[PDB]
Amino acid sequence: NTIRVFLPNKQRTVVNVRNGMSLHDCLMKKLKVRGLQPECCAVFRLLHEHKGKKARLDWNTDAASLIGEELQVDFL
Amino acid sequence: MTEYKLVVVGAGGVGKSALTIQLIQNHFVDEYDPTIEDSYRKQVVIDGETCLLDILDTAGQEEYSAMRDQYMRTGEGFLCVFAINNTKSFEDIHQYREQIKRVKDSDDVPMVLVGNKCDLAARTVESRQAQDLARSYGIPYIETSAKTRQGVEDAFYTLVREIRQ
Ligand SMILES: Nc1nc2c(ncn2[C@@H]2O[C@H](COP(=O)(O)OP(=O)(O)O)[C@@H](O)[C@H]2O)c(=O)[nH]1
Ligand SMILES: [Mg+2]
Numbered sequence: 584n585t586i587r588v589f590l591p592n593k594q595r596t597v598v599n600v601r602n603g604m605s606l607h608d609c610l611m612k613k614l615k616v617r618g619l620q621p622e623c624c625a626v627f628r629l630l631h632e633h634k635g636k637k638a639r640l641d642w643n644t645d646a647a648s649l650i651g652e653e654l655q656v657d658f659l
Numbered sequence: 660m661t662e663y664k665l666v667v668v669g670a671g672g673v674g675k676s677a678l679t680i681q682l683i684q685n686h687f688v689d690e691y692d693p694t695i696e697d698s699y700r701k702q703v704v705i706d707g708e709t710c711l712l713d714i715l716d717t718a719g720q721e722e723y724s725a726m727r728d729q730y731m732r733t734g735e736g737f738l739c740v741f742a743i744n745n746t747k748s749f750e751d752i753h754q755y756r757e758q759i760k761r762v763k764d765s766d767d768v769p770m771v772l773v774g775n776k777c778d779l780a781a782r783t784v785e786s787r788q789a790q791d792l793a794r795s796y797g798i799p800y801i802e803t804s805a806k807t808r809q810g811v812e813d814a815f816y817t818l819v820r821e822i823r824q
């Protein structure tokens with residue numbers, strides 16, 4: 584029911600997904616405690632269906648359509 | 660610069676994440692957001708040495724055991740935290756210290772017993788009870804408030820200092 588997000592610098596967060604929320608909403612609290620900025624970064628969905636390769640996210644993309652996978656966030 | 664890998668363990672709700680955030684960002688997190696796992700990295704200066712604190716904040720016991728089980732053989736230093744108003748979390752400490760002694764291999768692993776929420780007036784764990792526990796483990800005990808910041812640097816910097824020994 585969640586999201587396992589890799590952050591910048593070697594920081595992991597996992598996020599419980601409720602509803603309405605974008606990735607901005609479920610993650611903006613995660614970054615800002617880590618002194619980081621949501622519109623300074625890009626977020627991507629990880630597929631090792633090609634061996635370790637990244638699928639790009641809009642920040643207003645859904646939370647729910649991820650509820651069992653793996654993301655990582657990287658300065659834009 | 661030297662990296663210190665610190666792990667924060669203890670019952671759900673005792674303030675592991677609030678202690679950490681308070682260390683990291685100087686902010687008290689008054690909301691209760693249970694943790695699955697969070698790791699933070701921060702550059703600090705402790706006794707004149709610029710260093711890196713790698714801090715693994717772990718899941719209370721809400722729930723989520725099947726997660727930190729080598730992520731424990733990676734930790735160099737453990738903060739075992741209970742809240743002074745939550746007797747049950749003090750009684751849980753022992754399980755954590757046993758998990759820790761198991762997943763490493765010694766009864767001298769760098770460790771600190773932290774009694775958090777010492778700003779609350781509903782104390783049910785006396786200082787003396789916690790001091791006895793810590794004495795029997797061979798480690799320091801420190802009372803903390805993530806709200807007010809009492810003891811929070813002391814708690815982390817002490818754990819660093821145990822690690823440097
Ligand atoms: N009064 C007080 N409340 C605290 C303290 N630390 C945490 N809390 C509150 O207790 C709840 C549990 O905090 P949290 O850090 O999520 O607990 P954790 O599950 O062990 O990480 C949250 O509401 C925190 O605001 C403290 O030192 N004093
Ligand atoms: Mg937590």
